[PDB]
Design an enzyme around this catalytic site. Structure first.
Site, short mmCIF file in Angstrom:
data_model
loop_
_atom_site.label_atom_id
_atom_site.label_comp_id
_atom_site.label_asym_id
_atom_site.label_seq_id
_atom_site.Cartn_x
_atom_site.Cartn_y
_atom_site.Cartn_z
N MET A 25 8.37 -56.88 50.39
CA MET A 25 7.67 -55.63 50.68
C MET A 25 6.19 -55.84 50.95
O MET A 25 5.55 -54.95 51.53
CB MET A 25 7.85 -54.65 49.53
CG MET A 25 9.30 -54.34 49.20
SD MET A 25 9.47 -52.90 48.14
CE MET A 25 8.42 -53.36 46.76
N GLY A 26 5.64 -56.99 50.56
CA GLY A 26 4.23 -57.28 50.75
C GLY A 26 3.76 -57.29 52.18
O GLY A 26 2.57 -57.45 52.45
N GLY A 27 0.47 -62.12 45.77
CA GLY A 27 1.70 -62.06 45.00
C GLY A 27 2.91 -61.73 45.85
O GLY A 27 2.78 -61.45 47.04
N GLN A 28 4.08 -61.76 45.23
CA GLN A 28 5.34 -61.48 45.91
C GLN A 28 6.07 -60.35 45.20
O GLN A 28 6.31 -60.42 43.99
CB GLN A 28 6.23 -62.73 45.96
CG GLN A 28 6.39 -63.32 47.35
CD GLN A 28 7.24 -64.57 47.35
OE1 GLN A 28 7.67 -65.04 46.30
NE2 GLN A 28 7.49 -65.12 48.53
N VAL A 29 6.41 -59.30 45.95
CA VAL A 29 7.20 -58.19 45.45
C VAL A 29 8.38 -57.98 46.39
O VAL A 29 8.18 -57.70 47.58
CB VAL A 29 6.37 -56.90 45.32
CG1 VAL A 29 7.14 -55.85 44.53
CG2 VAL A 29 5.02 -57.19 44.66
N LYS A 44 8.96 -58.03 41.09
CA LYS A 44 7.80 -58.90 41.20
C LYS A 44 8.15 -60.26 40.61
O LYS A 44 8.64 -60.35 39.48
CB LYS A 44 6.59 -58.30 40.48
CG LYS A 44 5.30 -59.09 40.66
CD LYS A 44 4.11 -58.35 40.07
CE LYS A 44 2.81 -59.14 40.26
NZ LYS A 44 2.53 -59.42 41.69
N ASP A 138 -10.76 -49.35 39.22
CA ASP A 138 -10.47 -49.89 40.54
C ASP A 138 -9.42 -49.06 41.27
O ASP A 138 -8.42 -49.60 41.77
CB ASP A 138 -10.00 -51.34 40.43
C1 LIG Z 1 -0.44 -49.91 49.30
C2 LIG Z 1 1.02 -50.30 49.38
C3 LIG Z 1 1.16 -51.80 49.66
O1 LIG Z 1 0.73 -52.26 50.66
N1 LIG Z 1 1.79 -52.67 48.69
C4 LIG Z 1 1.97 -54.15 48.88
C5 LIG Z 1 3.44 -54.56 48.76
C6 LIG Z 1 4.04 -54.10 47.49
C7 LIG Z 1 3.86 -52.66 47.28
N2 LIG Z 1 4.40 -52.32 45.93
N3 LIG Z 1 3.93 -52.82 44.79
C8 LIG Z 1 4.65 -52.33 43.79
C9 LIG Z 1 4.41 -52.66 42.33
C10 LIG Z 1 3.55 -53.64 41.85
N4 LIG Z 1 3.60 -53.60 40.54
C11 LIG Z 1 2.88 -54.46 39.61
C12 LIG Z 1 3.50 -54.78 38.42
C13 LIG Z 1 2.87 -55.58 37.49
BR1 LIG Z 1 3.77 -56.01 35.83
C14 LIG Z 1 1.60 -56.07 37.76
C15 LIG Z 1 0.97 -55.75 38.95
C16 LIG Z 1 1.61 -54.95 39.88
O2 LIG Z 1 0.95 -54.64 41.08
N5 LIG Z 1 4.47 -52.64 40.15
N6 LIG Z 1 4.96 -52.05 41.28
C17 LIG Z 1 5.65 -51.44 44.35
C18 LIG Z 1 6.70 -50.61 43.88
N7 LIG Z 1 7.00 -50.50 42.46
N8 LIG Z 1 7.43 -49.92 44.75
C19 LIG Z 1 7.19 -50.00 46.06
N9 LIG Z 1 6.22 -50.76 46.55
C20 LIG Z 1 5.44 -51.49 45.72
C21 LIG Z 1 2.38 -52.24 47.38
#
Ligand SMILES: *CCC(=O)N1CCC[C@@H](n2nc(-c3cn(-c4cc(Br)ccc4O)nn3)c3c(N)ncnc32)C1
Length: 256
Positions: A25-26, A27-29, A44, A138
């Protein structure tokens, strides 16, 4: 707790191989599908061989997320999977962030949407500060997540200023410091220039303009406490007002 997936109260024992990778969906998520039920989640992945600084930040945020089950404005964790080489963190799948919604909208985001967004973000920051002593500070459109159900949640964890800048950017469609070429130039304009307030010719309510003005207070001594900011009429209005964020979200995502 590890090795379990909790989706809406139903607790499942699971391993990483019970999930189908549907892509980054993008660290790696990753977007992943739980084969047992068909539920789709965000995952994640923290690699054991990864950067020590990035992993330390991931573990700190996970510690707060695991303790934030009682905050409806923070993205929830459904479980974790620890392998010999990785840690997989299952999060609830949101739709997209406010930055992408602004890009698809190609224009200002309506005040009624920003009203519900403001109520969600402020109460998330107040919860993080009150319950866990976390000072986020932030907030930006890329940290504000929305889904097709109308939910608005914070992710990826003084705070009042960045919220005001985010509101001005989303309300006008223009980042107030878009013409600054370096980060230091932004700091000079924040300190030397007057705060970038909402325009007066866009039909914004006096409550919205007052709330943004209160957020963009340069003197930190004059900024309001949370118990004062939570009483602002802009917050009071959209705490109770019916706003169909879900339908607006679907209409915007349907844009090409
Ligand atoms: C502004 C939207 C965007 O460009 N992005 C980048 C790709 C991933 C997108 N995304 N992130 C999450 C997310 C991240 N986290 C998280 C958990 C921990 Br533990 C530590 C730090 C982070 O950042 N939780 N959720 C997304 C979710 N849950 N759903 C959909 N897209 C997500 C954001």
């Amino acid at each position: 707790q590890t090795g379990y997936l909790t989706i809406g109260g139903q607790r499942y024992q699971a391993e990483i191989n019970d999930l189908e990778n549907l892509g980054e969906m993008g660290g790696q998520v990753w977007k992943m599908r739980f084969r047992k039920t068909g539920h789709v989640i965000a995952v994640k992945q923290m690699r054991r061989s990864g950067n020590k600084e990035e992993n330390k930040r991931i573990l700190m945020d996970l510690d707060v997320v695991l303790k934030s089950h009682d905050c409806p404005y923070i993205v929830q964790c459904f479980g974790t999977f620890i392998t010999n080489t990785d840690v997989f963190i299952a999060m609830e799948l949101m739709g997209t962030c406010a930055e992408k919604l602004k890009k698809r909208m190609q224009g200002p985001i309506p005040e009624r949407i920003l009203g519900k967004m403001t109520v969600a973000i402020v109460k998330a920051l107040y919860y993080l500060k009150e319950k866990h002593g976390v000072i986020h500070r932030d907030v930006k459109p890329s940290n504000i997540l929305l889904d097709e159900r109308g939910q608005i949640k914070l992710c990826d964890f003084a705070d009042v200023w960045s919220l005001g800048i985010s509101l001005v950017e989303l309300a006008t469609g223009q980042f107030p410091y878009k013409n600054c070429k370096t980060d230091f130039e932004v700091l000079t304009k924040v300190l030397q220039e007057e705060p970038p307030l909402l325009p007066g010719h866009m039909g914004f309510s006096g409550d919205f303009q007052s709330f943004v003005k209160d957020c963009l207070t340069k003197d930190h001594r004059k900024r309001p406490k949370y118990n004062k900011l939570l009483e602002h009429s802009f917050i009071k209005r959209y705490e109770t007002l019916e706003v169909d964020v879900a339908s607006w979200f679907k209409d915007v995502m349907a844009k090409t």
